[PDB]
């Protein structure tokens, strides 16, 4: 995979130019394959000002996740003020957890590692355990680090005697590198999941800072609608967004995203017609109302 070597070299050079301290460090081959899956902030478009309706959760995320990890000499006064061993983002679908991860890669200066199953599980015997060990060793090398397993429930499923051999030893490798004897040096394991119940009890044990990114309430739906509708031109009087926010009974954040898109199209209908035959309509209450059936 020549694209994988290009990605490894690109991600490496970028990692050594933002943090010059990592130059003297070399890697094994599996560590380089893990380096192929490192997300830097410049390729992510979501910030905290792009996340709405979660401000207390953003502040808690800061005060107990980023600052205890990113600035240790600030917290060096007490030995029990340091970063968690792992963070779990769990909740109903479409409430922000993926953008929480995106803005964690954006604001927090930790070398962010977002890896998936395709880069962990391998065909050959014992390669995937070595991939996990290389992942954690790389995280120890990149001392401020966040290892992200998106959709982490599948990876941390209820262990059973009917599991596949490699899967079981892979889970044991992962847990050991998480809370084993050679403890990770300032390495955080941030995970996003939709079903917390499918996670094994030991895995959840060592994933101890867990945030309920729940369905948005009236305030949260208001802040989300407003956050989504930026860079679009609204209406002065014929538009009341408050009722619309509350009218969406139990709608998640992405359900709002889709309804906002569909209404943006329904308001720009004349723009579609004009550029089909060759001034967006102020986004007022008509489109949202005719769509969502209050």
Ligand X SMILES: Nc1ncnc2c1ncn2[C@@H]1O[C@H](COP(=O)(O)OP(=O)(O)OP(=O)(O)O)[C@@H](O)[C@H]1O
Q: Contact between 85 and Mg ion (CB under 5 A)?
A: no
Question: Which residue, 93 or 126, has its beta carbon nearer to Mg ion?
Answer: 93
Instruction: Give CA–CA dist 253/92, Å, rounded.
Output: 10
Question: Which residue, 93 or 282, has its beta carbon nearer to Mg ion?
Answer: 93
**Orientation angle between helical segments 218-228 and 253-267, nearest 10 degrees:** 40
Query: Out of Mg ion, ligand X, a second copy, none, which partner does residue 15 contact, by CB within 5 to 8 A per kind?
Result: none
**Orientation angle between helical segments 165-179 and 127-141, nearest 10 degrees:** 20
Q: Contact between 192 and Mg ion (CB under 5 A)?
A: yes
Question: Which residue, 192 or 267, has its beta carbon nearer to Mg ion?
Answer: 192
Instruction: Give CA–CA dist 222/228, Å, rounded.
Output: 10
The dihedral sign for the CA sequence 216, 103, 84, 193 = positive
Q: Contact between 44 and Mg ion (CB under 5 A)?
A: no
Q: Nearest-5° angle of CA 35, CA 213, CA 176?
A: 45
Report in angstroms how near the CB of residue 241 gets to Mg ion at its nearest.
26
Residue with tokens 């995979």: 1
Q: Contact between 267 and Mg ion (CB under 5 A)?
A: no
Q: Contact between 213 and ligand X (CB under 6 A)?
A: yes
Question: Which residue, 22 or 234, has its beta carbon nearer to ligand X?
Answer: 234
Known binding positions: 91-98
Instruction: Give CA–CA dist 219/168, Å, rounded.
Output: 44
Report in angstroms how near the CB of residue 88 gets to ligand X at its nearest.
12
Number of residues that bind Mg ion (CB under 5 A): 3
Known binding positions for ATP: 91-98
Identify the CA nearest to 96 among candidates 224, 232, 288, 259: 224
Give contact residues for Mg ion (rule: CB under 5 A): 98, 179, 192
Give contact residues for ligand X (rule: CB under 6 A): 51-54, 91, 93-99, 179, 192, 194, 202, 205-206, 213, 224, 227-228, 253-254, 257
């Amino acid at each position: 995979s020549r694209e994988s070597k290009a990605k490894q070299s690109l991600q490496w050079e970028k990692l050594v130019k933002r943090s010059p301290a990592l130059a003297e460090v070399t890697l094994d081959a599996y560590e380089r394959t893990i380096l192929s899956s490192i997300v830097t902030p410049d390729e992510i478009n979501i910030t905290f000002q792009d996340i709405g309706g979660l401000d207390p959760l953003i502040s808690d995320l800061h005060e107990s996740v980023i600052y205890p990890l990113m600035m240790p000499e600030v917290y060096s006064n007490s030995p029990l003020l340091q970063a968690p061993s792992g963070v779990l983002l769990y909740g109903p679908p479409g409430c922000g957890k993926t953008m929480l991860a995106k803005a964690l890669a954006k604001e927090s200066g930790a070398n962010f590692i977002s890896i998936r199953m395709s880069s962990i599980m391998d065909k050959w015997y014992g390669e995937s355990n070595k991939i996990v060990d290389a992942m954690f060793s790389l995280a120890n090398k990149l001392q401020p680090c966040i290892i992200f397993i998106d959709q982490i429930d599948s990876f941390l499923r209820e262990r059973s005697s009917t599991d596949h051999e490699v899967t079981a030893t892979l889970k044991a490798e992962f847990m050991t590198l998480w809370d084993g004897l050679l403890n990770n040096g300032r390495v955080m394991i941030i995970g996003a999941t939709n079903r917390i119940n499918d996670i094994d009890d030991a895995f959840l044990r060592r994933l101890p800072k867990r945030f309920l990114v729940s369905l948005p309430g009236s305030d949260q739906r208001y802040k989300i609608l407003s956050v989504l509708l930026k860079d679009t031109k609204l209406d002065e009087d014929e538009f009341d967004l408050q009722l619309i926010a509350d009218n969406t009974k139990g709608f998640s954040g992405s359900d709002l995203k889709e309804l906002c898109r569909e209404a943006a199209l329904d308001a720009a209908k004349e723009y579609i017609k004009q550029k089909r035959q060759l001034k967006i309509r102020p986004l007022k209450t008509k489109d949202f109302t005719k769509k969502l059936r209050m």
